[PDB]
Every structure is written in C-alpha cells, then in structure tokens.
RNA sequence: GCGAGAGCUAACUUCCGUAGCCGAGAGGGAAACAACCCAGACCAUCAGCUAAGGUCCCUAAAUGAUCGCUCAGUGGUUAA
RNA sequence: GAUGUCGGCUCGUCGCAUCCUGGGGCUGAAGAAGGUCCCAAGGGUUGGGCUGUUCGCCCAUUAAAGCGGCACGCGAGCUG
RNA sequence: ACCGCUGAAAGCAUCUAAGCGGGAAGCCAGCCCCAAGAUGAGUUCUCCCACUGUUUAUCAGGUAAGACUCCCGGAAGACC
C-alpha cells in the first residue's frame with residue numbers, strides 16, 4: 001500500500017542507545033502525485049507519484065501535457081503504488097514512522113556476465129590434482145540419450161545483477177523530515193544515487 | 206468440374222451453453238466452425254460460420270466436475286512443470302473449459318489454428334450480447 | 348468431397364446422406380449420385396425435390 | 407459419368423470416352439436422368455420421357471501422361487507413356 | 501486401524517460397512533477396526 | 538418402509554415445489570426433498586408415498602419422512618442436547634452466548650454458536666446445546682464434543698451424560 | 709496359429725512337424741506398426757457396389773431402432 | 789567402416805516400496821520414550837579415519853545422517 | 869489418511885447411497901521475480917495533425933510530434 005520514492009545515499013554508523021547500528025541514509029524527497037488511476041478509469045486502483053526534478057527544456061511535449069494535467073512540474077521519474085491515496089503530494093512525514101518495519105526495493109548493482117561460481121555458487125573443481133577445468137567451469141549439463149538435452153533453467157553463466165530486488169522487514173531507525181532524509185537499518189539494494197522504493201511491509205511478522 | 210468459392214458471407218450464429226453437456230455442445234460448435242451445412246462445403250479454406258458462446262460458466266458435466274475432469278498443462282522443460290486443475294477448479298476461467306475442449310475437435314494444422322478465431326466464448330449472458338454487433342442467429346443445441 | 352456436400356444439404360431439410368441416398372436408391376427411378384452433390388450445391392430448388400422425393404419412397 | 411451423359415444444360419461441346427460412331431454429325435442420343443427444360447425439375451424414369459441429342463464433334467488423343475512406378479531397395483523402377491482417347495460431342499438434345 | 505487385503509468379520513459385532521468406494525469394518529472393539537484401503 | 542406422520546397443530550407445511558416449506562411456534566423452517574418423492578397431507582396426519590419400491594426409491598423414502606418428522610418435533614418443541622465437562626479443572630463459563638471451555642489447555646477454547654443456536658450452562662461442568670434444526674444442534678455440540686474427546690484411561694473431556702466409556706487401564 | 713521337445717507350460721528364446729503370410733506383396737483396416745484381419749496393384753476415369761473394419765468432432769458414413777446391464781470412468785494395464 | 793569401461797569429483801533431476809520434519813488409526817498406548825500400519829515427497833538428509841573402491845567397518849555429531857531410476861545419470865565436463 | 873452431524877435402503881445399527889463439517893511440511897492462493905510475440909499482440913495519461921505530386925515520372929517527396937547519427941561520460945556493459 002503506502003510508500004514513497006527516493007535516492008539511496010550511503011550507510012554509516014549510528015548508536016541507538018548503546019548499540020551501534022548500521023543504517024542506509026535514503027533521501028525520500030517529496031513526491032508529487034501526477035495521476036490517480038481508479039478501478040473505474042484505468043480498471044484498477046493506484047497512484048502515480050514522481051521524483052527527481054527535470055529541467056523543462058528537456059521535457060517532451062507529450063510529457064508536459066501529462067504533467068500539466070495536474071499542474072505538477074516535470075519530474076523525470078514516475079511510478080505507481082497500488083491502493084494508496086491522500087491529497088496534495090507524498091512525503092515521508094506521517095507516511096513512515098520510526099520503528100515501522102519496511103521493504104526497500106531498488107535495482108541491484110550490475111555484475112555484467114558472471115560465471116557459475118559467482119552467479120550460483122557452484123564450486124568448479126580442483127586446482128591441482130590434474131585439470132583445465134580449474135576452479136570455474138560448470139560440471140556436466142545433463143545426463144545422456146534420455147532427456148537427451150538440457151533442462152530449461154539449468155543454472156549457467158549469464159548477466160548477473162542489474163535486477164529488481166526487494167529486501168523485506170527493515171526497522172526505521174530515524175526519520176528527519178524537512179530533509180526528506182530517512183535511516184533504515186540494514187542494507188538496501190543498488191548503488192548510492194540509485195532509485196529506491198520504500199513501502200509498508202508487504203508481509204511482515 | 207466441381208464447384209468453387211464464396212466469401213461475402215460469415216453467418217454469426219449464437220449458441221447457449223447453459224445446462225447442456227459440454228461434449229454435445231462442443232461437437233456442434235466445433236462442426237459449425239469447420240463447416241456445418243457448408244456453403245461451397247470446401248476444404249482449402251474455412252467457410253464455417255463464426256460461433257459466439259454465452260453462459261459457458263453453466264455448461265454441464267456428469268459424474269465428475271471434481272473427480273476425473275482434470276485439465277492438464279505442462280509448462281516449460283518439465284522440471285516438475287506438471288500442472289493439473291479440477292474442472293470445477295475451472296471456476297477461475299470457465300471460458301477455457303469450452304474454448305480448450307473445442308479447439309480439440311477442430312483440425313490441428315495451420316487452418317485449424319486459424320479456426321479457433323471464429324469461436325468466441327463468454328461466461329456471462331446479457332453482458333455478452335454486448336460484445337456482439339453483427340447478426341446472431343441463436344441456433345441453440347438440439 | 349461429394350459425399351460431404353450431398354448431406355450438408357440432405358441435413359438441410361431433415362434427412363442425411365445415409366438415409367437420403369438409400370432413398371433415391373429405393374427409387375431405381377433416381378440414379379444420379381454422380382453430380383448429385385453439385386445439384387445440391389447449386390440448385391437448391393432441385394435438390395429439395397430429390398430430398399422429399401426420397402422421404403416419399405421411404406416411409 | 408460412366409459414358410454418355412445425361413442431365414440438363416444448354417448444349418456445350420464436352421469430351422467423353424470414344425463413342426465408336428466416327429465421322430461427325432453422328433447424331434447421338436442419350437437417355438437422360440435429370441434435367442430442367444424450363445426450370446422443370448425432372449427425376450429418373452419420369453425423365454426418360456425427355457432425351458438428349460448430341461453430335462459427335464471430333465476424336466481426340468488425351469494429354470500424354472507418364473506412368474511411373476517405384477519400390478525401394480528392391481531396385482524396381484518403371485517408366486511408360488500413356489494417354490486416353492475420347493470423342494467430342496456437341497450437346498443439343500431435347 | 502488395519503489395512504488388510506482380505507477383510508472379514510472377527511466377532512459378533514463387526515459391522516462390515518461400505519463407505520465411499522471402500523469396504524470397511526466397524527466393531528465395538530477397535531483392534532477389529534478393519535479396512536481394505 | 539416408513540409412513541405414520543404425527544403432524545400436530547402449531548406446525549404448517551407447504552409442499553410448494555421442491556421446497557417443502559415449514560412454519561411453527563419455534564420458527565418457520567425449510568427442508569428440501571426429491572420431487573418424485575411423493576408426499577402431501579391426506580386429511581389429518583401426513584404421508585410420503587413413493588413411486589417405485591426397493592432401493593433407490595425406498596431409501597429416499599426412509600429419508601424424507603424422518604426428515605420432515607424432525608421439522609415437526611422442531612418448530613413444535615425444539616431440540617437441545619446436554620454435554621458433560623469431566624475431569625479435574627475442566628469447565629465451561631460463557632460470553633454472551635459463546636460457550637467457553639477450560640479443559641487443561643495452555644490457553645482457553647472459545648466456542649461460538651452458529652446463527653440459530655444457543656449455548657447454555659447449569660453447573661460450569663455441564664453443557665447444553667439447545668436449538669431448532671435437529672441437525673445443527675447435533676452438528677455443533679459435535680464441535681464441542683471434539684475440543685476434547687474422552688481419554689481411554691480416565692474418560693475426561695466432553696461426553697453424553699450417560700456416555701459409556703470404559704477405561705483400557707494402564708500401569 | 710495348431711502339435712511336441714528343450715526352457716522356469718520364461719523370452720520378438722531354441723529345435724523339429726504342419727498351414728498361412730513377409731522374404732520377393734503395393735491397397736483398406738489394426739493411432740503409429742513385415743508377418744494379425746480383409747485383400748493379390750495391365751494402363752486411364754472428379755463414375756458405381758462391397759471386404760475387413762466402421763458411421764458424436766478431429767476424417768468418409770445412423771449421437772440409428774428395441775429390450776436389458778454397469779456408475780465404475782468400469783470402458784481405457786493381473787491374480788490368490 | 790568403434791554405443792569409451794569401474795570409482796571419484798561437478799552438475800543435477802525424477803520415482804516412492806519415506807531416513808527427518810507434517811497429519812492420522814491401533815498398541816500389549818499411564819506421562820516421557822517407542823512400536824506398527826495409513827496419508828504424505830515441500831524442503832532437508834554433516835564432517836572425518838581405513839580402502840581405487842562401489843560397499844562396509846569405525847570416530848565425532850545430527851531432526852535425519854532414506855532406498856532407487858536417469859546409457860549401473862554425467863570423460864566432445866575434469867580426474868585416471 | 870483419519871474423525872464426525874442429520875440419516876434410509878436392512879421398523880435397530882451405519883462418516884452415506886440425498887446432504888453437510890473438521891482435517892497435513894503436501895495442492896491452489898498468498899510472498900519475491902519475469903510477463904501481451906498472452907499474433908486472442910490488452911488498458912491509461914499526454915503530444916503531432918490532416919500536407920505535396922496534370923489520366924506523361926501510378927507513389928514516393930517536404931515535414932509535425934518524436935527520435936536516431938555523432939561527441940563527452942557512467943555506479944550500464946563482451947558487442948549491441
């Protein structure tokens with residue numbers, strides 16, 4: 001349901017009481033609302049929020065049209081949120097609250113093409129008792145004349161990372177509104193400067 | 206020497222699946238699609254009336270709509286891609302119980318596939334008759 | 348191809364190849380079979396004739 | 407059909423098996439089986455009444471067709487020419 | 501419960517029942533509780 | 538075969554369709570049956586006559602009467618079973634209507650009567666499921682007689698007063 | 709297949725007797741399929757009657773008629 | 789006119805006649821702990837010493853340290 | 869699997885043939901991720917707009933909205 005948009009910023013040490021706790025400072029800048037999809041307009045409920053600002057000289061005509069339909073001010077990023085609402089815009093103020101468990105979802109860093117050891121763990125082989133299949137290189141891929149082929153999915157080398165990931169249940173250590181800053185314990189996905197989306201715990205204990 | 210073809214036609218009949226046993230209704234729908242009483246009654250291409258189907262949701266089975274009637278569908282490389290659902294379980298998508306029980310009785314090659322197109326099922330009643338703006342000779346079962 | 352059409356007309360009245368055919372048969376009189384389909388495809392006026400002709404030699 | 411027509415029409419030149427009576431003009435008469443001389447649908451026997459008169463137009467040698475047979479592994483390959491003769495007959499009958 | 505292939509009475513009580521497709525045995529005594537399936 | 542239908546006063550039947558409707562002092566009831574299953578009131582009392590006879594038909598026969606006969610004793614006098622809480626610290630109390638167990642579980646079992654049934658408790662060791670529809674009542678005290686089945690060694694839990702449960706006997 | 713031995717009255721097992729087909733045999737049927745079943749291809753034909761097998765739809769033809777049987781999906785993998 | 793052979797390693801995947809977890813009937817089931825049969829394969833099923841071993845024996849643990857199938861799975865993947 | 873309520877055929881008995889309820893790490897939904905080449909190619913919001921070319925060059929040609937090319941880089945990447 002509820003949720004906001006933001007830029008990851010870095011992690012750092014912070015003591016809450018006498019326990020040093022690592023956190024990820026996320027800037028959940030205010031988020032405008034640029035379109036309310038209704039189960040009677042677009043067939044399903046949801047809100048269109050926006051994020052970084054974009055210079056107007058860079059805005060497509062078609063987009064202006066959109067953004068103007070709600071006198072907003074071109075953002076550069078728009079995203080939806082099912083079953084969400086209110087009036088005006090969306091800022092963490094009153095949205096999230098210190099202590100709330102949340103789910104941060106960003107785009108994982110990108111590892112490019114990675115072998116099986118690093119993409120699936122595997123194990124490759126030896127390093128001395130004979131070879132050319134030193135450490136990496138997968139083993140065998142199938143079996144034989146039966147299923148005389150390979151399974152759809154057999155883990156293999158392939159572009160690793162650069163995916164959508166969602167780390168669940170994160171305590172919100174501290175919220176400094178009026179800076180739209182927010183500290184979540186643990187570690188959120190992707191690179192600093194990267195987009196991140198925080199929300200109510202999709203399904204927490 | 207034997208007769209050629211037409212086109213300028215496309216009878217738009219409308220069956221009703223209410224209470225009728227899926228099979229019988231099937232055969233019929235299947236038949237009028239491939240070529241019922243048939244125009245030039247010719248193979249090469251289909252002249253088989255387009256068929257609209259209402260209700261569906263209330264077709265009929267006999268001793269099993271729980272037992273036996275298990276529609277199977279085996280996904281990607283069969284790494285446990287064995288999916289089975291109760292026909293009653295087709296309270297999710299009745300429109301398929303028919304759809305995919307009639308495509309069965311239609312030819313299986315190029316044209317045949319071109320043939321499921323004319324078949325057009327709806328699990329409702331009135332609301333269906335909306336997705337219907339041409340003729341509609343409601344030629345019920347028997 | 349012939350037998351297929353001959354009864355998609357046969358059944359167009361209330362007969363069906365099986366029956367229909369034995370009928371014209373019941374009337375040695377009738378004896379086309381060859382072109383019968385065509386008659387049933389082009390001349391409905393005619394085809395009916397032969398149709399009813401059989402029922403009228405049937406029951 | 408199986409030799410010597412029948413049915414209705416309007417008199418066209420059609421080809422059938424050889425008719426024996428060579429020459430031309432050979433006024434030919436075919437019984438009849440069905441027809442509509444005036445949309446008058448007429449079935450067997452009740453049609454025998456009416457009849458058809460057609461004249462032998464010409465005699466022909468069909469289009470050369472090759473009869474080839476074949477079985478594998480056992481060698482066996484057979485090539486042989488062929489083409490069936492006929493008779494052209496201009497319809498005109500009752 | 502006893503799932504034997506050759507089910508049959510065991511004392512003047514065993515009420516050999518036939519529930520859903522199965523041939524069963526219900527007797528006051530439980531160790532008598534039989535069942536082909 | 539079965540036939541004798543004691544359909545006293547208060548009641549009111551209505552073989553209107555397959556809906557063999559009913560109404561009495563306890564409240565108007567309803568109890569479907571087959572159609573081909575014949576039955577209507579002939580004079581004073583009642584009767585469910587049957588088409589064929591043997592099985593398929595006679596079964597449904599030995600079915601309907603008893604069924605209706607229940608609608609009778611129902612609206613007429615209403616049902617109400619009585620349960621027994623038994624064994625140390627076993628006990629029922631109550632919340633509005635909701636029966637409340639307390640039979641040795643780390644926490645307490647809270648029961649709730651279905652729309653048209655009521656619980657009752659005399660001594661917090663004796664239970665009472667009173668109702669209309671013979672079934673439900675049975676079909677609910679059942680759920681009580683499950684929160685705790687009697688043990689084969691001290692027959693604790695719930696039971697049917699003159700409940701016959703012998704002890705296997707241990708050490 | 710039928711009659712025997714050999715073999716665990718096992719084997720698309722082995723060895724003989726005897727009939728048929730494949731081998732040197734196309735065609736229809738038995739989903740597919742040497743030998744099973746119906747049948748032995750001189751060539752042509754948008755002609756006709758049948759065999760075995762079949763006549764809900766995928767393919768040709770009665771979702772035929774009458775009196776029954778089983779509710780098992782038996783039908784559409786065996787026994788004490 | 790070549791279908792590479794034992795074991796290991798790597799990679800798996802499937803059956804169930806279930807090793808462990810889950811649900812049950814009976815027990816000669818007091819409770820705790822078991823036995824046994826029924827249902828159930830989701831996931832899991834350790835590390836070493838000896839031997840090429842597969843197996844098995846043993847150490848030390850474990851909820852458990854299942855049994856089989858896939859050309860006794862996998863050498864155009866390695867070992868040898 | 870197993871346990872039950874109402875209950876005949878067997879005026880009793882019966883988890884059953886009418887009917888109804890509970891009930892597993894399993895099935896379906898749920899969680900995270902992909903997803904209309906879901907060729908049955910879906911929905912929504914916004915932008916550009918109705919040009920030119922004589923039966924001799926029958927259609928492409930100026931263009932809008934928009935984008936690509938190219939340059940400089942990147943927490944994106946084998947190349948794209």
Ligand SMILES: [Mg+2]
Nearest residue numbers: 123124125135
């Ligand atoms: Mg390594």
Ligand SMILES: [Mg+2]
Nearest residue numbers: 717786787788
């Ligand atoms: Mg035997």
Ligand SMILES: [Mg+2]
Nearest residue numbers: 809810811812
């Ligand atoms: Mg257990």
Ligand SMILES: [Mg+2]
Nearest residue numbers: 143144863864
């Ligand atoms: Mg290999």
Ligand SMILES: [Mg+2]
Nearest residue numbers: 941944945947
């Ligand atoms: Mg580059």
